[PDB]
Amino acid sequence: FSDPDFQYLAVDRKKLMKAFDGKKNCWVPDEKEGFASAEIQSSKGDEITVKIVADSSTRTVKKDDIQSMNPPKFEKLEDMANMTYLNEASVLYNLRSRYTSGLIYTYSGLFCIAVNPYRRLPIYTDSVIAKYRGKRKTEIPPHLFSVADNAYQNMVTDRENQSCLITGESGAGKTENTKKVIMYLAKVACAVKEGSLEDQIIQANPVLEAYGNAKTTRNNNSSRFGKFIRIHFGPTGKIAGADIETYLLEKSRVTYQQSAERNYHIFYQICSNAIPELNDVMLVTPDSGLYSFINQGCLTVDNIDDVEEFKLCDEAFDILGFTKEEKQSMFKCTASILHMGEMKFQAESDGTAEAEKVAFLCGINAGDLLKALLKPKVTEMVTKGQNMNQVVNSVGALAKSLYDRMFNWLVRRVNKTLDTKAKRNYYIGVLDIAGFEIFDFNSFEQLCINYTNERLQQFFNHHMFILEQEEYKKEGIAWEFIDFGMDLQMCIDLIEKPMGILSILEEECMFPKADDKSFQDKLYQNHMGKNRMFTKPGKRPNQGPAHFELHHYAGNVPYSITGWLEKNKDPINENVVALLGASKEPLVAELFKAFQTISAVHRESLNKLMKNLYSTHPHFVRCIIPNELKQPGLVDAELVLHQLQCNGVLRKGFPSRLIYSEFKQRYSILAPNAIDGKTVSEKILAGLQMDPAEYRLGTTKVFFKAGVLGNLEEMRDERLSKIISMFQAHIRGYLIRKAYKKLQDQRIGLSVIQRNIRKWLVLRNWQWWKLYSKVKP
Amino acid sequence: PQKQIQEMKEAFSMIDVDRDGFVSKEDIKAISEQLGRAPDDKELTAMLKEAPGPLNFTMFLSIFSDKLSGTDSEETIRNAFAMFDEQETKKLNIEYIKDLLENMGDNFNKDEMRMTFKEAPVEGGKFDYVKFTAMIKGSGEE
Amino acid sequence: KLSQDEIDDLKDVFELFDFWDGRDGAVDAFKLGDVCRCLGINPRNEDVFAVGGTHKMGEKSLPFEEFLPAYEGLMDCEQGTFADYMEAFKTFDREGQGFISGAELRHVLTALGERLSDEDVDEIIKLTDLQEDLEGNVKYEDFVKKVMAGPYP
Numbered sequence A: 001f002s003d004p005d006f007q008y009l010a011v012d013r014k015k016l017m018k019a020f021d022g023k024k025n026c027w028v029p030d031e032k033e034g035f036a037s038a039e040i041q042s043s044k045g046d047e048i049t050v051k052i053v054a055d056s057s058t059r060t061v062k063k064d065d066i067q068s069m070n071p072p073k074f075e076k077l078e079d080m081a082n083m084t085y086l087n088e089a090s091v092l093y094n095l096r097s098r099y100t101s102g103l104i105y106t107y108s109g110l111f112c113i114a115v116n117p118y119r120r121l122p123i124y125t126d127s128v129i130a131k132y133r134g135k136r137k138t139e140i141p142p143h144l145f146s147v148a149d150n151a152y153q154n155m156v157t158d159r160e161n162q163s164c165l166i167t168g169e170s171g172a173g174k175t176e177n178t179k180k181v182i183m184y185l186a187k188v189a190c191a192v193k194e195g196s197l198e199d200q201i202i203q204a205n206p207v208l209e210a211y212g213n214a215k216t217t218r219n220n221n222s223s224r225f226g227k228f229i230r231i232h233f234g235p236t237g238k239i240a241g242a243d244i245e246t247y248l249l250e251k252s253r254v255t256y257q258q259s260a261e262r263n264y265h266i267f268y269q270i271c272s273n274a275i276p277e278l279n280d281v282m283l284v285t286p287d288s289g290l291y292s293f294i295n296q297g298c299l300t301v302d303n304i305d306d307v308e309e310f311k312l313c314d315e316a317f318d319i320l321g322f323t324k325e326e327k328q329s330m331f332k333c334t335a336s337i338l339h340m341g342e343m344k345f346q347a348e349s350d351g352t353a354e355a356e357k358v359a360f361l362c363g364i365n366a367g368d369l370l371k372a373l374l375k376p377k378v379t380e381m382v383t384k385g386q387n388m389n390q391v392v393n394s395v396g397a398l399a400k401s402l403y404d405r406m407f408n409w410l411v412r413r414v415n416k417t418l419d420t421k422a423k424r425n426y427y428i429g430v431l432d433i434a435g436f437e438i439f440d441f442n443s444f445e446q447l448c449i450n451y452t453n454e455r456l457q458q459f460f461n462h463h464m465f466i467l468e469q470e471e472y473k474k475e476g477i478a479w480e481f482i483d484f485g486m487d488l489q490m491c492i493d494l495i496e497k498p499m500g501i502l503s504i505l506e507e508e509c510m511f512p513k514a515d516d517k518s519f520q521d522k523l524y525q526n527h528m529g530k531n532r533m534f535t536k537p538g539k540r541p542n543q544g545p546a547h548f549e550l551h552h553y554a555g556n557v558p559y560s561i562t563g564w565l566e567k568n569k570d571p572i573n574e575n576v577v578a579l580l581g582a583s584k585e586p587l588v589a590e591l592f593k594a595f596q597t598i599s600a601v602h603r604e605s606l607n608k609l610m611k612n613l614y615s616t617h618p619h620f621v622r623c624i625i626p627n628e629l630k631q632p633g634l635v636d637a638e639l640v641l642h643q644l645q646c647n648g649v650l651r652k653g654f655p656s657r658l659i660y661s662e663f664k665q666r667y668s669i670l671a672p673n674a675i676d677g678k679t680v681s682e683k684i685l686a687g688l689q690m691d692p693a694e695y696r697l698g699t700t701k702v703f704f705k706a707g708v709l710g711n712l713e714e715m716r717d718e719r720l721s722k723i724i725s726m727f728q729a730h731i732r733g734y735l736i737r738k739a740y741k742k743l744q745d746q747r748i749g750l751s752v753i754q755r756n757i758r759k760w761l762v763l764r765n766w767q768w769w770k771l772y773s774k775v776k777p
Numbered sequence B: 001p002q003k004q005i006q007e008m009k010e011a012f013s014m015i016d017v018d019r020d021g022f023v024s025k026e027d028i029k030a031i032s033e034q035l036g037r038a039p040d041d042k043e044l045t046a047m048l049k050e051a052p053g054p055l056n057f058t059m060f061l062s063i064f065s066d067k068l069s070g071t072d073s074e075e076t077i078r079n080a081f082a083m084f085d086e087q088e089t090k091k092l093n094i095e096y097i098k099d100l101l102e103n104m105g106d107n108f109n110k111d112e113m114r115m116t117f118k119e120a121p122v123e124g125g126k127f128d129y130v131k132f133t134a135m136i137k138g139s140g141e142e
Numbered sequence C: 001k002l003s004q005d006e007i008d009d010l011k012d013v014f015e016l017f018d019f020w021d022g023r024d025g026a027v028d029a030f031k032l033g034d035v036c037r038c039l040g041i042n043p044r045n046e047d048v049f050a051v052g053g054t055h056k057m058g059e060k061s062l063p064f065e066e067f068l069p070a071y072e073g074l075m076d077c078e079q080g081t082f083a084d085y086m087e088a089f090k091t092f093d094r095e096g097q098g099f100i101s102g103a104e105l106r107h108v109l110t111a112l113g114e115r116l117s118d119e120d121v122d123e124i125i126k127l128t129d130l131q132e133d134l135e136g137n138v139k140y141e142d143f144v145k146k147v148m149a150g151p152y153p
């Protein structure tokens, strides 16, 4: 490699990289750095004593919790699949090493890890792009880019669909490298008011992001919704078009913020006063902290300029094809919500001074509205009364619904501006969606996000069991005692098939009782006790109340059915709807035109998504968050390890393996008659009376099936300790034999000295002797 | 035993008061009744029945010899002890032999154990078998 | 099954351990096993107690006729072979060169399996004359040969 700006961007090894013995070098656990490099000093069984290389200190550590260190031969590697040791300790290393040096990418084997910078990096430039263009994953250093190429490459020549699902925690890098993958794939395959299809595709983020993203402690720009953009290519491998598909907007945020969070960015920028010539178009007063719906949490995200992100937003509309009409409408309806929020009011209307702004914006009447919001209608057709709450939360629902109905318009609208009918042949659809989140308290909100992931966790697993079969044959074994996967469909069925809680909360919303036991029971009586996953709540940290409990891939999660019916349908004053439905605003009217619960709508949104992905040859990018504080170049010891345990570190009920070598150097003591690497092990089992199905003897390693290994470990430990006893009885029996002649002679000794004395007495007791002595002069 | 005989004879005479060249029933009940507590009658009678014919000197050393016929020497003895002196200290800390003798070999019975230590030579816990042997069998006094 | 004389070697021996607690025609159960080692065996403690062993001297007394069977018992039991021992000790030799530190050896013998009083260890280490080097390690191979070698080579 020669080098323009591959520098603090890609590998960088001639200006940095310039004593090791894998017998004393190893990693021990460290409460501070996760693990720590140290040297082994002494042994005493399960008490391997060592000196901490670093601070040169001393401590004891179980021979087990110690982990092998990789020779310096693999420092800052680029395919941790190559390292000698791909274990839990060494992986944390090779990544932190790279991370501190600003390489922010790594291919641990068939993956593409990506520790978040939290700093702007110079590695996405056109120069760098082209230096990555067309190149094989190996002739070029790790980098998101080539992750996308190999897709296009394969798409073109392998003629199929490609998918790059980027998944990480929150604030990791997902909704970031997702953009780079579109922006790249578009720098390379270009085709040629309204801007360029290229420009549009790209520009269509500040909008979607403007309405669907907000501040979360974890992340200033958290993506409150899922996204799945496809990118089709023409019969000449050119961008023929793209189509978006957002999943599960967080309706609830529109009116509430946990402290330390903000509402969807826009709202805040709308009061930014970026385009003053609009304050009066929306009736807004450039002040965020003045509208109850957006000022509940923090009002500003450090390093996120609203005024600008506003101007940039607007611009974006221009380029998507939006008009001055459509555009401004968007804003208006958005602006309105702020006010829908201010309508003050047991008590009924307290002033109407603002409720009017809402009246004007949505292009309908102050009277009709302000009226229906208190005295609405409905087989019988009546009029009802609503109180202090039967109205406030009635407004809450108004806004949310609007913002929601709106968002969908925004996507749908955007999918129109890039619907060009150029001929389509294969697509490269990136997918940026959140992940299995399990809060202290979990509801319908969470069951969704998660259920969604459940199906995704089966896609990955389906695809991993595939390469499995590809390791099963190279080192040539067919080993099909496949029997598996059921446990993942288990939770999957219980969540989407007909009789699952997911059609119940859907038909139990048709049934006109709609009360929370009418459902918080329907399930029970249908799945309570009748499942392995579904179970009554458990019993721990600071968790809230939870009704049924799911056995998700990531684990068991408690769920609260309180108010799901409502959360599932859309409880707006059907009264106001039609009031809106018939309006003088092209949007509002459209927004409320002439099934669809939040979930039979997801049922498909998702059934659809999968059917796409399963038509692709996937590519995974695992984003990892380095630390809470968010400063670039830092590593939260644990935090990382944690993540590294939930993706691909290498599993779920598959047969384990061992290079034939190491099987000898570990389990030979088990079948002791041997003295060739692979034949040594090749024997042991046979003699160990091993049932032949429990294993297969491929050429590089041995594949075992369950705890067959664990059964060995267990056997080993039982044996190792018997020998030890045996060697001890040998020491024991040796002594008893050393001290055996002294044992025999003494018996002669204690016979001379009893008999004699036992005579010498008789004699002192002999009448004659007595006499004799009396006479002894 | 050559010159032990020099004594037997000595004893015989100082014993044979009437010096009836023979040790008589009245010959004992005399010399005894002369020094210490003399024996009874059957006591005496059993002393004579212990000798085939009249008590001439011969018949005298004869009854004695049998009574010393199966004793091991002062070596086969003094060394039979030392086998337990590991240290070559000329002593068996008391309790050791006390237990050796009683709860091992052919277990020494109570009174059998009592008379053997009645006068045995004991010091600072130790036990001088060296002396105790030179007493049990033989040397040092008369 | 045993040969007459084998039974004679038991006959001879037994009549010594009987002697030591008292010639009474019986042997303390505690010593029952300790008696089998005098016949070139090395039945682990779990074995001896398995046939009639005892942990405290003075709980049960055993006559010959009874003894013998208990012996045939402690025979069919597994004895260690050089390899085993080696393949066991080897599981403590990291360097691989084959040296097992001093303290460790003491540990193994006095911590693992059926343990040993520091004495025996300290004894068996004198008898066989095991020697640690300047660094302080002994080759287990050499030690293992001696323990199996017997006190009288």
Ligand SMILES: Nc1ncnc2c1ncn2[C@@H]1O[C@H](COP(=O)(O)OP(=O)(O)O)[C@@H](O)[C@H]1O
Residues within 6 Å of the ligand: A116, A117, A118, A119, A120, A121, A168, A169, A170, A171, A172, A173, A174, A175, A176, A177, A219, A220, A221, A222, A223, A623
């Ligand atoms: N590659 C990157 N370069 C610079 N900053 C990044 C990068 N990846 C992530 N970040 C930082 O982390 C924040 C969170 O990233 P984001 O992609 O939005 O996370 P996610 O979608 O995974 O929830 C970003 O706002 C940004 O500050």
Ligand SMILES: *[C@H](C[C@H](O)Nc1ccc(N2C(=O)C[C@@H](*)C2=O)cc1)C(=O)O
Residues within 6 Å of the ligand: A435, A436, A457, A553, A554, A642, A643, A645, A646, A647, A652
């Ligand atoms: C990370 C959770 C974590 O790291 N632990 C586990 C995740 C996943 C699994 N699975 C599967 O997903 C399939 C089989 C299996 O056991 C186990 C543990 C998270 O928070 O996302």
Ligand SMILES: [Ca+2]
Residues within 6 Å of the ligand: C017, C018, C019, C021, C022, C023, C024, C025, C026, C027, C028
């Ligand atoms: Ca006895």
Ligand SMILES: [Mg+2]
Residues within 6 Å of the ligand: A171, A174, A175, A176, A221, A222, A223, A224
């Ligand atoms: Mg995001």
Ligand SMILES: [Mg+2]
Residues within 6 Å of the ligand: B016, B017, B018, B019, B020, B021, B022, B023, B024, B027
């Ligand atoms: Mg006379």
